[PDB]
Amino acid sequence: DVEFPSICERCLGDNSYVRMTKEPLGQECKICSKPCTIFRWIKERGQKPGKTQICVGCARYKNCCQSCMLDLQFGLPIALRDAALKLVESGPTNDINREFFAQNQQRLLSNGETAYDSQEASAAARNLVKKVEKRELVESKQILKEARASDASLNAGNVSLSINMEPELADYKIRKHFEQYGPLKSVVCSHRAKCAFVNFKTRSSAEIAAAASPLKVQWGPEGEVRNAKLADLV
Amino acid sequence: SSRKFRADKRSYLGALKYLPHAVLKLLENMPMPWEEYREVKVLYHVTG
């Protein structure tokens, strides 16, 4: 009898006793673009009142919370759920098609069959974590000296490098690696070039950090990747 | 002409429907020639 909106108890307050109001037809569904009733309550004294933002047809076809839109089974954003878990196909993003899908899905879904069962949801969660753990575990000579000497003069089967003392992996990994070798200024990097250049407040920290040497390095777009292919022949 | 009251403009404009009623109630109680001023009981929207 237009009784309740579905809200999880994380954003329903830690009090088992709360009061809320409804304003019928108070907003257009942010997905259905449909006239829907609003519900306002207080999570806890001292913060701004919450309110429901999506209709009852949604957050049910999505099995989600009308206010926080965290999925009611796992508790992480429904967008990330449908992007990574990929349980069942979602709707479009354009206006007319999205509202058409919302209307027809609400119709065929109130006919009685449920579009969301949690058994397959947990199965897909375990499948995703399994795939994650699975993820966890003369032509070369001519493209070698073709341009290295050119740049070296301009601004400076097997190949073995030299070690000099002249005075997938994000950048924060570099940040928490060099912090014990001296203060950091900026870490400029590029995955394609695979070259990460750091700067310190003093050259003494740089030289003491570089002395730790015996995967590591010591001192256009495609134009910077010529020496990155040396990784294939390192 | 201020955004401080930008939330009330829709209600402010919807009272345009009942404005002629306000005109009738105002003209019905116009002071007569023999009285210098007349105090009228009034009912107003909290929006103004």
């Binding site: 954003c11 942010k30 997905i31 933002q53 206010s67 926080c68 839109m69 965290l70 954003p77 429904i78 967008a79 990330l80 992007a83 990574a84 993003t93 206006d95 997938e168 994000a170 950048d171 924060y172 940040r175 200024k185 900026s186 870490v187 400029v188 990097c189 590029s190 995955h191 250049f197 256009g220 777009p221 | -």
Partner: protein, 125 residues
């Protein structure tokens, strides 16, 4: 003031409805991608455009961006002053997006669109 005057940290997860900056997130994602992103997609990278003084654009933006939050990927076009810095958390990402607009490096900070690289799409997924 009634709001935090500090920098968001690693464990500062907010509601999906409320923008991590305190605002609210709609669904249509607009056409200029101007003020606040949509909740139907989560992009950790932002388009920053502006000056292209010399080859040191990468380092200057790095200097001007590390202080705003944890950085994941910096990709700055050499031909034009266009960069696509990718952040680690939504809070730092949107804080820097809102906090660096019309600054000196005015900067045209906007929300990035879908990356057409099938490899970048694969790694992002």
């Amino acid at each position: 003031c009634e709001y935090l005057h500090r920098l968001p940290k690693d464990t500062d997860f907010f509601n999906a409805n409320v923008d991590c900056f305190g605002r609210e997130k709609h669904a249509d994602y607009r056409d200029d991608m101007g003020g606040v992103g949509s909740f139907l997609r989560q992009n950790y990278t932002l388009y920053v455009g502006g000056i292209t003084p010399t080859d040191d654009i990468e380092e200057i933006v790095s200097r001007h961006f590390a202080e705003w939050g944890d950085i994941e990927r910096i990709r700055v076009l050499n031909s034009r002053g266009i960069a696509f810095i990718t952040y680690l958390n939504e809070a730092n990402a949107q804080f820097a997006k809102e906090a660096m607009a019309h600054q000196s490096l005015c900067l045209n900070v906007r929300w990035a669109t879908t990356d057409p690289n099938p490899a970048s799409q694969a790694r992002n997924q």
